[PDB]
Design a protein around this ligand. Structure first.
Ligand SMILES: CC(C)C[C@@H](C=O)NC(=O)[C@H](CC(C)C)NC(=O)[C@H](CC(C)C)NC(=O)OCc1ccccc1
Ligand SMILES: CC(C)C[C@@H](C=O)NC(=O)[C@H](CC(C)C)NC(=O)[C@H](CC(C)C)NC(=O)OCc1ccccc1
Lengths: 232, 212, 200, 202, 233, 239, 196, 212, 233
């Protein structure tokens, strides 16, 4: 059993393996999430359709449960492993607690899993950051972010991946109660933020919408184009 | 041992002024058969401790090997510390209880006599971990036959001399030979005093009246 | 023994006797058969005294950890499920444990019956113990969801008292509890001898 | 089954019957119950054939390796100790009664008894098996100190013949073996060679 | 600079540098003294605080009714060793109903501490100990090192600036055997005082005393409990 | 970097880690052991590092078995670990076979245990040399020595430590094959004093042990009276 | 003993079960639910030893839901039935067998309605109709007499009533209320309880 | 092979305003025989706590040793002595740890609580425990309890003042209940050992009973 | 190269030294002990306005009478806190009492430094925890404040500051703190220092304050209480 200490401290108190995992998250495609009054929206920029790939099998937005979904930015294979671990935990929580999971609970579970891989023996840190959105049983919308280090926070709106600094800067200035006043207005805010980085727009961005009672919904290309047209 | 095979009968013990004396016959009965008639059931644990045992003889031999090995190890250090009779009695109680708990008991009833720090010790240990210290002990059928005589004398006279204790033991050994169907006429007497442990040869209950 | 609990308009009422027997010998007449798991959760004990006390205490520790981790009080359904899973690992190994978990959760008042045999159900009224059959008759005839608080106390006391009268292994004092939206309260502890004078 | 071993000045004499039974059927009537563990060390087997054979093979392997390592001939006491160690540890699984006899330079002829249970004891002479119960008085009455090899051979032959006559699980032929510094001399008494005692007729 | 990175690597001079560094850890620790007489064994330690508002770190720990230790080095390792010693003392009492002899307890420590110093990926225990106990053979004072070696002493000092203390103990070693308990403790305190850096005095806040005797179970004196001993020096 | 592990041969076929272990053994104080007709005698030059140490502290003579002795040199911690191993081997032998372990067999078992630590990088070679001595009527006096590499041989007189060469020269003139333990004890004390360097080391205490017919085959410390006589004889010899 | 019954029609599956939770000659619950929602088109009816039924059914439910969440589509009724049999059979010879009798009902878009029968030995059978418990002895003949492959759901409910009336008239246990449910292309529909 | 055997013994505990009494007989027996006449069932745990164990002597010794070890472990870790309540809670967990191989022991803890008042805790073999004002356990538990309930508890008596229980009255009551029990119970009646826990310390008294 | 269990020439473990260095990257946290109670304060250090400050939990409750303040790699402290909570409930379950603050700190400190690479466990910790913890609570001894470092060393302290501004926060605590200080004065003093060291302007949303008192349980100040205190401060 390989049991070498992959992650160790360094002079000045740094975990280079954690920092490298972060620079691996930064190379990934951009992802955006905003928390609306009665809606939570997740957006992501597609590097290239390629006109040959089957778009069904390259989704970067996944549903952990009926009331929770997440989008990642980093290594695709690592995300698939983390997503599966969350999915089994969500079902396990349903089995024991007899109630649907809360966004904070599953975020805490995922973060703890990531932290464990940074302190375990013979293991590499997970090279992904995740944006988890959903609705608690009380109905309050939630939006969380998790880093490879194992830390997590609750965000009104945040972006991860390539060019996340600019998108976050744009969101900070453009996020207000008026902007999230209506569900359509909230969607436009995500699209405009993504357009800050991605070039083509419409054909290079994927959007997912989650409402209080309704399940996860993926906007069709026609809907995305219409919103882009309304934006311009 | 789930079922004993070759067993020794009662063992006696009584403490006097300045020592302890233990008796036991040299006979291993294979279920109503005097099979082995020259086996000593008394062991010299160390310079101030001696041990007699009843029940399965093979289990007694195992304890002889283990206990003898520990004494050797302690003497190797040569640090001035040696196991006292109380320490050996405590160790045996734990060993017997642990085997009973695991459901693989050592089918024995042991009597431990010793003399250290100018004080006599006499202890008892059953196969189930029962242990205690009394002025006189008698395992097996000795509890029914020999114990009443020893207790009666000791209640009358709490402290005995070496000669009185030896004569008392011989009388009890005679009674056991009369009425115990698994007893033998040849037996050993072990004594521990300030001068160490001495084991007496194959004595015989010569005084056996048979006026029928 | 006789434990009893039912739900009504103003919460859930829990009552029990205070007798413990060892064979045909009355070991004690002051046993506390209701466990204060939390200021909002209660548990009753019936069956093995050691089994019930140990596993309820284990449940109380698990519930407290749950609250610390999740920063929210555990629900009645979750607590009963926790106990059901803990004791199911030892099914068929001789544990005797019949419990009712009573509390007020976010969904409202809750009452679950958990047995060492593996049963876990919720209902309006329950009764566990040797005298449960006797307490069922009195409770069934006098129970109504629209009972007043004072009436509910009287019905619980009468049901336990009648059970102690007919059951050899039930007796002592009737301990009464009432779980409300803001927590449970120790209503009273009336001796069966005194109740016998009152009812006759 | 009847196994007998005697000790004389400078060696030991071993003997056994040659009957193996499965109920009342004699599966083998010429079985050899004297297993040579080493040179000048023998063991007489009684009880379960499977257990005794397995135990004898294991001790033979252990003693042979031990002797090679030490570059000295094995001691009879050591061979008995190895039998005791295994028979005692697996006392609940093994049904095997053994007597170990042989010669070594240090102590000369020795006879050790390892009955069921795993106890070990040095004996001037030993007997075992189902048929041993019928000759306890005979060996006790007719045994003497200082017997020679020839006397020991005759003493063992007479005892075994009586046991085979009475016991139903004993019979066939008598296999003997005298062990001394010179070597091992084995012989088989069969037919009229077996000692005979007239049966009273009224 | 390639022979001082593992404990399983001998150097050309036949030295294991890792063990040498562990010995250097106890030197950075704080001073502590231990001496014995015909009847008593005494431990006196000098506690120091990281900050003025922080309590002085404790240096004397209980092991059994007749054994105590004074630590100097990595505290986490000290607790691991103290825990091991307590279990060994408990096991002896449980099995033999008898106090574990001090020398046999020290031998167990050496055996345990030696294993890390010979396996890849393990490290020596970065802590030195001054074991004071009483057994059937009389008072005992022992010294342990990160290297799994121990010495039966009559008076020893370990820790920072402990050579000045050892100098005092050797000078007055001839008097310890026949002095009373009060006199013996004062000898331990005077040595510890020598270790102190000139402009500083022994205080009830930084001095801790441990005493074990023929008819005196191991006791620890700290805070105002030390005032009776300091009064007179 | 060919000398950083015991699992690598040097270009010329040498395990430097083992060689360094022997070098550590060569910095200790000398310890000698002489075999004679009656039995075996051991002697050790115990330096007093500090006057604060109790007499008998850090004893370098051990009783691995009631009939077997043991003298050591080098890292003391490793030596004590080997002594525990030797005791375990001796005890296990008695339980399995029922009699005292022959000294030759005991030396072989301990030597193989030592040798197993010079084959892998996961452990390091014992940095200590030791010698085993015993006496039995059947086997007579026997003396053995084992080095870090795991090699064991029989000796008539052996030395280990700093002044190994000087001690070997002195031992050559004893003619031990026809001498008794009583006379050998005085000779052992004399040699230790001669090899010792008073100029370099401050002071030392002489530790003596023997096993033979006079002790009935049990290894034990030499009596205080005999040790005092031997020390006086050695000091007088050093005119 | 509990009671389960299932009738399969051309394009639907009708299932019913009693609502009694007894404990040593006392009805502790009168509205117990013995049907588990595997998915939007599958129902598991589990009866047997206390604890075993809930533990097994919940365990299967978690896995079936997990499969849906991981693959984006729900398990077919046949696959779910065979998955259940595999788990039951595997535990059969272990130290912790599950003593449960199961009826699995479901609807698949392609295959159509399906009713499956399984006993505690994990023998799986597909039948037009099945029943579990002692009441199965009295009601199975009624189903054989009156069942047809082309039975309308209105007639199926009537046939279910005749089976439940027989239990009231001739069975010894007190089973007043019965849960009723139906599965078709539109999912699981809860019908009115049949009460007496 | 039965791993259990009953050795008799009776224990009793009474709590008072400023004291706690724990008493027991000193007879150890097996079957119809008497092992020793000087085997008290009282065990001192701390300066203000005493435990009385009766039943299978093999489990009695093991449990007492386990408790003695655990107390030292607690003191070392928490730097303070255990309380009577803490000991009672721990003993419940220790007893239940062997639920499926229980200690055939009856325990009664008597001592002072944190407030300085007497406290008595009774136990079952499998850890079920409960605080009480007075309790009797062992062979003669059924004989002792009814009188304690009548006299200490003032049960079934009317128009009687409930005067607080004094130390002298409690001591006389303890002796009387045991004297009566010795007359009817075979397993008890060699001698009476009384342990009195108060603020000053633990005091011990011995009173003779009828030998047979 | 340079295994985790390695000793520097000065006897200081490399990994522990680096872990201690990692503490200086954390936000400042202050804890003051008073006869009336113990108060804990910590700067939240909001990175961006879009982050929800309610989700930064740098003060957590171990039990009703124990509270913990964290600084450093906050993700590491999650396992330490979970161990402390579990240990506290185990003690209540067994002894039916409440663990003391020192005993809880001791259990957590023992968990720290139990890291290894070879022959430790299938998934043992590979590195020390990079978090410094301040344990505050009320026990039989009254209010208690304990500081635990990555090295597994814990000590009681009257007032202790940890984090990026520990040097300078401790300096201020030295001048102001005194034994007879009340709980109100302690809270005011803690806030004044925090406002001084913090780079951002102190307000009711970017700091966390909690207290434990002999009567009340562990209490975390809400915004309304925080606004009241800072107004005077
Ligand atoms: C607290 C309640 C559970 C009290 C009451 C209620 O049923 N318990 C009981 O009546 C049961 C008997 C039976 C009815 C299960 N009694 C008990 O459990 C009593 C309680 C002591 C106070 C004497 N103890 C008892 O029977 O223990 C014997 C025993 C010994 C070893 C293993 C298991 C059980
Ligand atoms: C080979 C001898 C040393 C042992 C021999 C002598 O009595 N033992 C036996 O004959 C005993 C008798 C008794 C256990 C029924 N029989 C046996 O051990 C077995 C029967 C087993 C079911 C136990 N008999 C048997 O089938 O023996 C087959 C056999 C035939 C020839 C040589 C070796 C073995």
């Amino acid at each position: 059993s390989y049991d070498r200490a992959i992650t160790v401290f360094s002079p000045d108190g740094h975990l280079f393996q954690v920092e490298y995992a972060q620079e691996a998250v930064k190379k990934g495609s951009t992802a955006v999430g905003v928390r609306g009054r009665d809606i939570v929206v997740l957006g992501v920029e597609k590097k290239s359709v390629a006109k040959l790939q089957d778009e069904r099998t390259v989704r970067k937005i996944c549903a952990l449960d009926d009331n929770v979904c997440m989008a990642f930015a980093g290594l695709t294979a690592d995300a698939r492993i983390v997503i599966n671990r969350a999915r089994v935990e969500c079902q396990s929580h349903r089995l024991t607690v007899e109630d649907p999971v809360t966004v904070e609970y599953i975020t805490r579970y995922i973060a703890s899993l990531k932290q464990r891989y940074t302190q375990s023996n013979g293991r590499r840190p997970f090279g992904i950051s995740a944006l988890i959105v959903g609705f608690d049983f009380d109905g309050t919308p939630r939006l969380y972010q998790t880093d490879p280090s194992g830390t997590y926070h609750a965000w009104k709106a945040n972006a991860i991946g390539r060019g996340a600094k600019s998108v976050r800067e744009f969101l900070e200035k453009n996020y207000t109660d008026e902007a999230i006043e209506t569900d359509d207005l909230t969607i436009k805010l995500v699209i405009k933020a993504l357009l800050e980085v991605v070039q083509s727009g419409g054909k290079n961005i994927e959007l997912a919408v989650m409402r209080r009672d309704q399940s996860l919904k993926i906007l069709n290309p026609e809907e995305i184009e219409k919103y882009v047209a309304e934006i311009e | 041992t789930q079922n004993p095979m070759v067993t020794g009968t009662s063992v006696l013990g009584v403490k006097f002024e300045g020592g302890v004396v233990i008796a036991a016959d040299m006979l291993g009965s294979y279920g109503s058969l005097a099979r082995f008639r020259n086996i000593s059931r008394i062991m010299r644990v160390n310079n101030s401790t001696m041990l007699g045992a009843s029940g399965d003889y093979a289990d007694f031999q195992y304890l002889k090997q283990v206990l003898g090995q520990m004494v050797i190890d302690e003497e190797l250090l040569g640090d001035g510390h040696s196991y006292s009779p109380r320490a050996i009695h405590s160790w045996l109680t734990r060993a017997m209880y642990s085997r009973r708990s695991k459901m693989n008991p050592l089918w024995n009833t042991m009597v431990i006599g010793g003399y250290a720090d100018g004080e006599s010790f006499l202890g008892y240990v059953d196969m189930l971990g029962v242990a205690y210290e009394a002025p006189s002990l008698a395992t097996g059928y000795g509890a029914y036959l020999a114990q009443p005589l020893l207790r009666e004398v000791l209640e009358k006279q709490p402290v005995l001399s070496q000669t009185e204790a030896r004569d008392l033991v011989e009388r009890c050994m005679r009674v056991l030979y009369y009425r115990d169907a698994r007893s033998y006429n040849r037996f050993q007497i072990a004594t521990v005093t300030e001068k160490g442990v001495e084991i007496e040869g194959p004595l015989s209950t010569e005084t056996n009246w048979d006026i029928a | 023994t006789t434990t009893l609990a039912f739900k009504f308009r103003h919460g859930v009422i829990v009552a029990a006797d205070s007798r413990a027997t060892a064979g045909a010998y009355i070991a004690s007449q002051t046993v506390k058969k209701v466990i204060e798991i939390n200021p909002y959760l209660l548990g009753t004990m019936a069956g093995g005294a050691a089994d019930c006390s140990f596993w309820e205490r284990l449940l109380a520790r698990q519930c407290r950890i749950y609250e610390l981790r999740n920063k929210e009080r555990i629900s009645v359904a979750a607590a009963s499920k926790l106990l059901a899973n803990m004791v199911y690992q030892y099914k068929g190994m001789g544990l005797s444990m019949g419990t009712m978990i009573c509390g007020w959760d976010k969904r409202g008042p809750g009452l679950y019956y958990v047995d060492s045999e593996g049963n876990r159900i919720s209902g309006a009224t329950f009764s566990v113990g040797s005298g449960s059959v006797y307490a069922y008759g009195v409770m069934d005839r006098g129970y109504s969801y629209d009972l007043e608080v004072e009436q509910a106390y009287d019905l619980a006391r009468r049901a336990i008292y009648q059970a102690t009268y007919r059951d050899a292994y039930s007796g002592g004092a009737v301990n009464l509890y009432h779980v409300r939206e803001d927590g449970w309260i120790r209503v009273s502890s009336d001796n069966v001898a005194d109740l016998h004078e009152k009812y006759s | 089954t009847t196994i007998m071993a005697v000790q004389f000045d400078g060696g030991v004499v071993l003997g056994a019957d040659s009957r193996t039974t499965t109920g009342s059927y004699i599966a083998n009537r010429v079985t050899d119950k004297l297993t040579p563990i080493h040179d000048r060390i023998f063991c007489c087997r009684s009880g379960s054939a499977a257990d005794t054979q397995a135990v004898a093979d294991a001790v033979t392997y252990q003693l042979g390796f031990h002797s090679i390592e030490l570059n000295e001939p094995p001691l009879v006491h050591t061979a008995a100790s190895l039998f005791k160690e295994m028979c005692y540890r697996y006392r609940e699984d093994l049904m095997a009664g053994i007597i170990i006899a042989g010669w070594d330079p240090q102590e000369g002829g020795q006879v050790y008894s390892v009955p069921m249970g795993g106890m070990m004891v040095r004996q001037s002479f030993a007997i075992g098996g189902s048929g041993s119960s019928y000759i306890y008085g005979y060996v006790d009455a007719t045994y003497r100190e200082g017997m020679t090899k020839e006397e020991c051979l005759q003493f063992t032959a007479n005892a075994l013949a009586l046991a085979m006559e009475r016991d139903g699980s004993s019979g066939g032929v008598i296999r003997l073996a005298a062990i001394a510094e010179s070597g091992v001399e084995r012989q088989v008494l069969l037919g009229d060679q077996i000692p005979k005692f007239a049966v009273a007729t009224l | 600079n390639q022979y001082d990175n593992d404990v399983t690597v001998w150097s050309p001079q036949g030295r294991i540098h890792q063990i040498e560094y562990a010995m250097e850890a106890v030197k950075q620790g704080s001073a502590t003294v231990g001496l014995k007489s015909k009847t008593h064994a005494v431990l006196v330690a000098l506690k120091r605080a990281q900050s003025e508002l922080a309590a002085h770190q404790k240096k004397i720990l209980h092991v059994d009714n007749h054994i105590g230790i004074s630590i100097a080095g990595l505290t986490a390792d000290a607790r691991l060793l103290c825990n091991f010693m307590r279990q060994e003392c408990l096991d002896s009492r449980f099995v033999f109903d008898r106090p574990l002899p001090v020398s046999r307890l020290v031998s167990l420590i050496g055996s345990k501490t030696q294993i890390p110093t010979q396996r890849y990926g393990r490290r020596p225990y970065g802590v030195g100990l001054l074991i004071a106990g009483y057994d059937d053979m009389g008072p005992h004072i022992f010294q342990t090192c990160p290297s799994a070696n121990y010495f039966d002493c009559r008076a020893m000092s370990i820790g920072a600036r402990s050579q000045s203390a050892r100098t005092y103990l050797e000078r007055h070693m001839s008097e310890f055997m026949e002095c009373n308990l009060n006199e013996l403790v004062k000898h331990g305190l005077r040595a510890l005082r020598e270790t102190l850096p000139a402009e500083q005095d022994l205080t009830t806040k930084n001095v801790s005393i441990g005493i074990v005797g023929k008819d005196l179970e191991f006791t620890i004196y700290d805070d105002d409990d030390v005032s009776p001993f300091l009064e007179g020096l | 970097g060919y000398d950083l592990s015991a699992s690598t041969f040097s270009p010329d076929g040498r395990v430097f880690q083992v060689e360094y272990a022997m070098k550590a053994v060569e910095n200790s104080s000398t310890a000698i052991g002489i075999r004679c007709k009656d039995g075996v005698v051991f002697g050790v030059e115990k330096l007093v590092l500090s006057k604060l140490y109790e007499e008998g502290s850090n004893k370098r003579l051990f009783n691995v078995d009631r009939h077997v002795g043991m003298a050591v040199a080098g890292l003391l911690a490793d030596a004590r670990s080997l002594a525990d191993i030797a005791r375990e081997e001796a005890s296990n032998f008695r339980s399995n076979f029922g009699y005292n372990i022959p000294l030759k067999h005991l030396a072989d078992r301990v030597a193989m245990y030592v040798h197993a630590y010079t084959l892998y990088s996961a452990v390091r070679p014992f940095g200590c040399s030791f010698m085993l001595g015993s006496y039995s009527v059947n086997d007579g006096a026997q003396l053995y020595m084992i080095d870090p590499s795991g090699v064991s041989y029989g000796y008539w007189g052996c030395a280990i430590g700093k002044a190994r060469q000087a001690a070997k020269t002195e031992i050559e003139k004893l003619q031990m094959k026809e001498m008794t333990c009583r006379d050998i004890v005085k000779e052992v004390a004399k040699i230790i004093y001669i090899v010792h360097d008073e100029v370099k080391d401050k002071a030392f205490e002489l530790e003596l042990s023997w096993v033979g017919e006079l002790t009935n085959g049990r290894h034990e410390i030499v009596p205080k009276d005999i040790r005092e006589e031997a020390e006086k004889y050695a000091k007088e010899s050093l005119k | 003993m509990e009671y389960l019954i299932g009738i399969q029609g051309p394009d639907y599956v009708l299932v019913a079960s009693d609502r009694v939770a007894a404990s040593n000659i006392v009805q502790m619950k009168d509205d117990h639910d013995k049907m588990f929602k595997m998915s939007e088109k599958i129902l598991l009816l589990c009866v047997g030893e206390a604890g075993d039924t809930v533990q097994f059914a919940e365990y299967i439910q978690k896995n079936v839901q997990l499969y849906k969440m991981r693959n984006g589509y729900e398990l077919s009724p046949t696959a779910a039935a065979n998955f259940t049999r595999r788990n039951l059979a595997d535990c059969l010879r272990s130290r912790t067998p599950y003593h449960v009798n199961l009826l699995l009902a479901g609807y698949d878009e392609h295959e159509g309605p399906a009713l499956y029968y399984m006993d505690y030995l994990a023998a799986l059978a597909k039948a037009p109709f099945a029943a579990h418990g002692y009441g199965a002895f009295l009601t199975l003949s009624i189903l054989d007499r009156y069942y047809t492959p082309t039975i309308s759901r209105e007639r199926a409910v009537e046939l279910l009533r005749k089976c439940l009336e027989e239990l009231q008239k001739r069975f010894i246990l007190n089973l007043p209320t019965f849960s009723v449910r139906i599965i078709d292309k539109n999912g699981i529909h809860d019908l009115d309880n049949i009460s007496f | 092979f039965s791993p259990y055997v009953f050795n008799g013994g009776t224990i009793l505990a009474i709590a008072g305003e400023d004291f706690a009494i724990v008493a027991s007989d000193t007879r150890l027996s097996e079957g119809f025989s008497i092992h020793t006449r000087d085997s008290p069932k009282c065990y001192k745990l701390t300066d203000k706590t005493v435990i009385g164990c009766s039943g299978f002597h093999g489990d009695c010794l093991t449990l007492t040793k386990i408790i003695e070890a655990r107390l030292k472990m607690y003191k070392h870790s928490n730097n303070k002595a255990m309380t009577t309540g803490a000991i009672a809670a721990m003993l419940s967990t220790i007893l239940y740890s062997r639920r499926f191989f229980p200690y055939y022991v009856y325990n009664i803890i008597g001592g002072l609580d944190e407030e300085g008042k007497g406290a008595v805790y009774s136990f079952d073999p499998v850890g079920s425990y409960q605080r009480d004002s007075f309790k009797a356990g062992g062979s003669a538990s059924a004989m002792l309890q009814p009188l304690l309930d009548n006299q200490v508890g003032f049960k079934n008596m009317q128009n009687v003042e409930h005067v607080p229980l004094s130390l002298d009255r409690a001591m006389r009551l303890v002796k009387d209940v045991f004297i009566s029990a010795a007359e009817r119970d075979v397993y008890t009646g060699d001698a009476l050992r009384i342990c009195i826990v108060t603020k000053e310390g633990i005091r011990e008294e011995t009173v003779s009973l009828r030998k047979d | 190269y340079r295994g985790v269990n390695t000793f520097s020439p000065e006897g200081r473990l490399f990994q522990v030294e680096y872990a201690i260095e990692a503490i200086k990257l954390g936000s400042t946290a202050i804890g003051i002990q008073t006869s009336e109670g113990v108060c804990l304060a910590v700067e939240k250090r909001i990175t961006s306005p879009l982050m929800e400050p309610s989700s930064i939990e740098k003060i957590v409750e171990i039990d009703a009478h124990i509270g913990c303040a964290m600084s450093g790699l906050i993700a590491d402290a999650k396992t330490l806190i979970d161990k402390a909570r579990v240990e506290t409930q185990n003690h209540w379950f067994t002894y039916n009492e409440t663990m003391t603050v020192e005993s809880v700190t001791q259990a957590v400190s023992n968990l720290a430094l139990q890291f290894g690479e070879e022959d430790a466990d299938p998934g043992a910790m590979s590195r020390p925890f990079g978090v410094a913890l301040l344990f505050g609570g009320v026990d039989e001894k009254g209010p208690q404040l304990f500081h635990m470092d990555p090295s597994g060393t814990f000590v009681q302290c009257d007032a202790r500051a940890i984090g990026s501004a520990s040097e300078g926060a401790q300096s201020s605590l030295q001048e102001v703190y005194h034994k007879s200080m009340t709980l109100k004065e302690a809270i005011k003093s803690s806030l004044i220092i925090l406002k001084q060291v913090m780079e951002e302007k102190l307000n009711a949303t970017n700091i966390e304050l909690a207290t434990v008192q002999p009567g009340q349980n562990f209490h975390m100040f809400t915004k309304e209480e925080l606004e009241e205190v800072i107004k005077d401060i």
